[model samples]
Target chain A: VAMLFYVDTLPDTGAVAVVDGDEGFHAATVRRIRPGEQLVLGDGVGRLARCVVEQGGLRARVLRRWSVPPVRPPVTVVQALPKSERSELAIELATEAGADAFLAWQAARCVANWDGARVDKGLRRWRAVVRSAARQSRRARIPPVDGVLSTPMLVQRVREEVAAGAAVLVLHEEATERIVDIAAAQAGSLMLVVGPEGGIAPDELAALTDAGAVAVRLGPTVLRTSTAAAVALGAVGVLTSRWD
Target chain B: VAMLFYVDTLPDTGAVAVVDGDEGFHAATVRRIRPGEQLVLGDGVGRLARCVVEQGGLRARVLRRWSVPPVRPPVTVVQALPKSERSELAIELATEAGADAFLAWQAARCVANWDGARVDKGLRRWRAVVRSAARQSRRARIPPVDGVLSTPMLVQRVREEVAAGAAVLVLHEEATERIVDIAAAQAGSLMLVVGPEGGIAPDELAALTDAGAVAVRLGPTVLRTSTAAAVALGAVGVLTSRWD
Candidate 1:
């Protein structure tokens, strides 16, 4: 509940770390954190350094540590690229829903299909959005936002994960199996694939399913691609006691 | 997945109905309903009349009926009024997430803070959003969108529902309990509460909790008001096998 900040890594005990640059400026100007106020600086992978604002700098004491190791079957949301606003909205909600990671997809029917430099820019933009969301939620471990993937490439990734003993679920509306059908205990990680606003192309669905990703439905009603991942993540988190 | 439309009532005998007026204009001009194409028209109750486009007049000849009696514990999202875009988005996603009804809250911390005629206009706008989303999801029964309520009004309604033996949950970031802790069988109807971007004030939380609403958290990370209800709805739907 203190003023939170992110650092590349945490410093050792009795270390004097000055909150500088843009983050410090925002903390000072916007948050208006006063001197002697306790602050939490995290490495985004469990290490949290608890510091106090002092004479023009942050003086720190490294807090022990915290991790989500006991929470098995970490959720990974694979979302197809929607338009800018919806895409950012999805990442933000999914991050808050405690998704362990995110994968961008260039589904066949995507409206703003990315390629070349656009893909590079899109990846950066999406990653930035996820980072802001993670920071907003004060998440300890920031979920990784991977580069965009084509349908076959994603299928290959699913195959690789399945081979590595992960549970891969394709959230297809037309799928007969519900997301509840999956046994969360069966795998160490869960990959939840969500399509774009236009929906997934049939051939892509076939390829993913053939490559070992099981088709699953969250419910009878249709969810926008941007919204589906967070909903699915929430379900998995609740059912698995990850929320608890 | 037939072309879906909403009607006030269905007549007997010939079992023929004309798709005219605003609904017809939307079907004809926007969605471009074609002759001989199968369609599903609903009375926004439990009655789903199957029909097909006929030779003359965009009239539909009734074929059969469909209903869902098994899925229990219908969902209701009690959301604090947000800004225009996010409020509309909540109704849209909540509808698609299978919420049976929606309640707008003009909580103390709500940024929009609708009062008087503003409340009337906001309710109308929000209700229109639910109708569009329900139609888009091809839902047989359109969820009822209720009028906006003040803090005391909301508290009174919560008390009434609790008296009627429904489960009312107030989602708070600071809550010690998780939503997964609730037993679905214990409550006939579940109300999922969501706060605005600024969040539910301590006084508001106390008022609702005093009325027998259980405070619960969806997950470890904090969700935005626009996104939380849908996530909670999805979790309840999945855990209850409503999705299956």
Candidate 2:
């Protein structure tokens, strides 16, 4: 598998750019792509460029470019922290499923805490994971990671987003309606909230419900915190035709 | 949460039986449960019983007395095998989600090949995983493992079951309808089929559709094989009032 990098700016055709730094080291040492090897690069949001090795072993130049327009029906995943490292897995899977954004919440029952200084470090790690997964899955876009909000703050975010015309959904085991029942064509901009392994506490559920967040059940089983987010994102991708 | 177990027949009040040999060891060694401890056991098919510990050591037994009636809307999962060990994770999650039965199949794209010799061993492992998950999740039912089947044989079983008036659904990415769209007030028995990692091949999809299997989409994303099955089963539990 080729390693993909998210570049801030697009490289001009026939122009060479030094892969240098971490990405260069990874490609040179880990992946060990030799000269004349082909690689893919993306602009994170939606520009994919195919490049080939040129000159130096760590430096590469753009040989060809093929760009895909950003897929429609952008999705956002709001997840409550779980005790295990499964939360990282959730982010990875969500990216593979084409989530455009991620929201992390410190719910009432969340066992993982993201306080003060650790927030930036956690976010950075999450971003790296998402980027890697996106590249492996051949996704054109890399989703943004945001939050570490309290339950109330998370609900407020959902309310604000929904009020601005985004479709907000809360996946709860006690939900009376199934997710498909609430799914609409295009879905446009969407947000899905998944609770922790312990599930959403009663108060949090009430607050989310009060915020105009529709509760949707995924299926007949109770999913793990990580699995729920991944499945929800996958479902969203299928419904929105992002994968197609 | 309370542990659940399934039994061939109801045991008399104050009578103890070592329902699971492996679980007994965990309860004694890992959990270190002692005499006078109260625990809940399920017969997996819906009967839940409250019991008290009679012996304190590794061979501890519970005095089983009263049992609760079976819950409504029993869940059945039809999972396509994947290339990795994700099948075990799927079984564990399905059991925790309170599925009543689990069906494994070798779909068109399933990378894992299980010949007749490996069938019994695979089934045994699946059953053990389900049992462990059931105990850990404190479920009232330990979902049964249905061993392995080929695509044709699996579809045949689904058709027969559905012909007998069971609610049957095949989850496919390209399906026109969503799972929620098929939920009815009185779907007595529900079976949800999840395709392999590469998804159900075109021919298999056609066969399922022709066999009267209702096609349903899970959500907006393209879920992996295990995650898809878990989410579908969890959603069923919620929709059927099994997870209230």
Candidate 3:
């Protein structure tokens, strides 16, 4: 699979693109594509550009621009950060499942804390995972990884988005309604809030529901943090006609 | 999140059960679970036992007995094997999602070949993954990982099970009907078939469809091999009222 990475800034050359830094290192050393190999490059938002390699190393240049199109919607995954490697896996799987954006929150039941230093490191790791997944999945756009937030901050953000007319869905195992059933009735932008490993706290659920977020169950099983996001994305992909 | 694991073979006392291999190394070194700490154990076939550490390290002993009643009807996942790592992930995710049994088959589109020594190695890896996942999910039953099979062998297995009255659902993205639609009308032991990454080949689909395997869509998106199985299990968990 091809490796994909995101850059904070993009060069203005729309016709030709160049890969540098960690992505360049991976493409040249790890993937080991030759000078004429074809590759897909994305800016991780919705811009997917197809390019052919001119050189084989860290400074590889594009020989041609074949195509560019946006494949991911603006849907964002609002997940309560999980413990250990589950949080990282959640980010990677969400990207592979085609989430457009991600927002990490330290919920009430979260055992892991994201201090200032941890937040910076976590963001970098999360972004790297999303970039790699987007590349492997042949996606044109990379999902943006937002920095960490507290439970209150997460609720506020979701509330703002909902107030602006975006639909929000809170995934709870206890909910009588299914995600597919709820998603089938909604359209346009959507946001999904998934809880920590222990599950969403009652107050957190109340806050989300108060903000007009519908409570929906992904299915019947109690999924891990990572699995839940992927299933949710797959469900949304079908409901929104994003999967072809 | 407590660490959970399945011991397929345990003594009658369930105490001082030998874990003298990789599982021993994991419990002793990796997790470093200490004496007096509580952990859940399972027998992999519908028995969950709670245990508390009496002695520290790999040779620790703890008392255990059956706790929760077995939940029925058990769900089985019959998946066409994909490439190496992907197939492993499929078993892991399925076990975590609560599949009661897993059957691996070599379908037309399967890229992985399990011949001679490779078969034993593959099955061993699958067994280990299932055991680990069962523990991780804290389930009373550790899902069984069956031996590999050819297309004809796979059909025979399903036919016998179905003849005995098991509800079988073949998951295909192209199916016009969704699983929820069919699940709404039926109830019993369910066997779900998820195709490999490249998807079930045309002839394979025709064969399955001919054998009375009801074609059903998981949702709307094209799920990856492992993700598809996991989602299918999750959906069945909800449909069967097995979710906690």
DockQ: which candidate is best? 1
Identify the candidate with maximal lDDT. Answer: 1
For A1-244, candidate 2 gives per-residue lDDT tens digits of 3557767776888777676477777787786777888887777777777888774246678877776765566778898854347788778756755678898888877656556778777777888888877766667777888767788788888789878777788888778887666654545678888887677888888899888788887654455565666666545544445543
TM-score, per-candidate, Cα-based = 0.85, 0.70, 0.71
Q: Given candidate 3, what's the lDDT at residue B174?
A: 75
Docking model 3 quality class: incorrect
What TM-score does candidate 1 reach? Answer: 0.85
Candidate 2, residues B20-106, lDDT tens digits: the string is: 566676677766777777766666555656777667232224455554455566667888855357788767755655567888888
Write down the worst ten-residue block by lDDT for model 1 chain A. Answer: A62-71
lDDT of 3 by residue, A98-148 (tens): 677899888888857556888888788887777776666656666788858
Number of backbone clashes in candidate 2: 30
Model 3 C-alpha lDDT versus the unseen true structure: 0.68
Q: Which scores better on DockQ, 1 or 3?
A: 1
Clashing pairs in 1: none
What's chain A's TM-score in each predicted model? Answer: 0.90, 0.89, 0.82
Distance from true position, residue B226, model 3, in Å? 3.6
| Tens digit of per-residue lDDT, candidate 1, span B8-92 | 8864535889876777877778778778888888876777888988842368888887764534678778988665787898788
Q: Which pairs clash (backbone N, Cα, C closer than 3 Å) in model 3?
A: A44-A141, A44-A142, A45-A142, A48-A140, A220-B238, B4-B135, B5-B135, B44-B142
